[PDB]
Design a protein around this ligand. Structure first.
Ligand code: A1L38
Lengths: 302, 324
């Protein structure tokens, strides 16, 4: 429901301002970059465009997740009517469409064409990437650059668009807008790499079959990609889609003993450092400090 | 003949049809394949034709000597929005077929079909932003929201025999006429004619779009099952009650029982279709289509005489005479 979502954002926005006075992540980044750049621009309060932008970004994020979660009914010769009722497919599609459409309508009425271009491209690349996703599972030839680009299209691009668009609506210089873009992109990549690290390490310490982990479904991320550089048996096991009994557990221990987790953690740190450096075009402020702290807090999840 | 009606913009349509394939890109083979499946399936391209005709009529009125690239891109954008809508409508309907070919979701599953339509809506928006006209950007964004609003309303009222005619006309506007009305107003905007002419071009497209939808709904009954691809009454069968049924319900109350049962008793669908024909439903729906067509032709009188205007008038006539 767009109504409920717009409600929570405003509520979550309220406590944010009230805190800096003396999911939430994407609107919070919009708010913080909005306030930092609005002060730089001489604005006395956030504009309507800033406040709408935070709602727009979260509507797009939520619509994206709702659609990405729709079921694949492709091979079925009957029972499709039942499986869609069971899984609420029509509601999912309709809700996502209306959320997307509401966000596009908001965006048009903010009247900034640069922002519309930016955000429209984010959704293109997201939908395009998610269609391709199934074809990339278990492909051990994926490069680290391919994985970062994939993570950008899936996660970091919307975040980078949101922080750039916050600066655009403040009217700060193009150079600062580009720096806010770079902060969002590199925080988003650092965020995604840490999520991928955590999926792995949690999988290696859990009691049952890690059957729902990234590695188990063939979604090969930073720690595994690094490991594959030094682990010929890891490649062979992944290529087998863990056919042999208990081979998933073996693959997990090969990744764990490789240097891969440490190298992924350092990849997350370098992107985080680039993010923090992107903020130095801003003067000292509680908003800049908080944006710096989000990077640190992300890396502290280890 | 569609070719006879559309020859004054035949060159504009040929260029558009050449371009549609590349407008999705080439990096994503599955995406390319899905777009090809609908673009190459045989659509009439009424919407781009209306855009070219109004573009040329208004451009002439405004003193322009040639169609702008914005006019040309607009026609592609409108067909793309229409195509994204069809992809999602087929998912929402679980339609297995669309003009002879299997639907995108039949080939790749509902999730890929949804994401393909999403790509096409976002691509449409991105092309339109690059035309740099915020008035049109806002107008089209409203139309796309109208589509989503209409799909929700239609899914919420399936088999609902208490639907009013006014509700049916709003749903028809959301589903079909709103995009056409915005496309003809935007064609006028890119020619730089007056606000008043722009408003008239909106009203032309609105009423022709309503007239076209009412006729499509009539033809779902009166057309044969082969010449339709799908059997007659396919709208009624999924619970989408259109003008002929809304009218028929006023004279044949057993339709309510049949529809309320979602056609559970066997052969009840052909019983329902019989009742529609027995009523004055089809003729009352045709005269509704005619009323909107007359309003459409009236909205053209603010333009000078031109072959473009004459063809825009002829579109109204062809629709009412249509068997399709
Ligand atoms: N699915 C969809 C719909 N919709 O009405 O279904 C409307 C718009 C849309 O893309 C955009 C494009 C730009 C901003 C926000 C969303 C999508 Cl991807």
């Amino acid at each position: 429901v767009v109504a409920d979502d717009l409600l929570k954002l405003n509520n979550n926005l309220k406590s944010l301002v009230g805190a800096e006075n003396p999911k939430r992540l994407r609107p919070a980044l919009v708010f913080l970059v909005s306030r930092a750049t609005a002060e730089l621009a001489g604005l006395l309060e956030l504009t309507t465009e800033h406040q709408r932008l935070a709602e727009i970004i979260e509507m797009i994020h939520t619509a994206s997740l709702i659609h990405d979660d729709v079921i694949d009914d492709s091979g079925m010769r009957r029972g499709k009517e039942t499986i869609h009722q069971l899984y609420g497919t029509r509601v999912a599609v309709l809700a996502g469409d209306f959320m997307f459409a509401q966000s596009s309508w908001f965006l048009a009425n903010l009247e900034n064409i640069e922002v519309i271009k930016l955000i429209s491209q984010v959704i293109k690349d997201f939908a395009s990437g998610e269609i391709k996703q199934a074809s990339t599972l278990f492909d051990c030839d994926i490069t680290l650059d391919d994985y970062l680009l994939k993570s950008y299209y899936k996660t970091a691009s919307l975040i980078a668009a949101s922080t750039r668009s916050a600066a655009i609506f403040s009217g700060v210089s193009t150079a600062i807008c580009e720096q806010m873009y770079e902060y969002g992109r590199n925080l988003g990549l650092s965020f995604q790499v840490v999520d991928d690290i955590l999926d792995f390490t949690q999988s290696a310490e859990q009691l049952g079959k890690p059957a729902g982990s990234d590695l188990a479904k063939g979604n090969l991320t930073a720690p595994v990609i690094f490991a594959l550089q030094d682990e010929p048996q890891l490649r062979e096991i992944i290529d087998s889609e863990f056919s042999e009994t208990n081979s998933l557990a073996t693959a997990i221990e090969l990744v764990h003993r490789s240097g891969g987790i440490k190298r992924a953690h350092e990849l997350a740190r370098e992107k985080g450092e680039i993010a923090i450096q992107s903020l130095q075009c801003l003067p000292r402020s509680e908003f800049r400090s908080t944006l710096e702290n989000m990077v640190k807090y992300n890396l502290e999840r280890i």
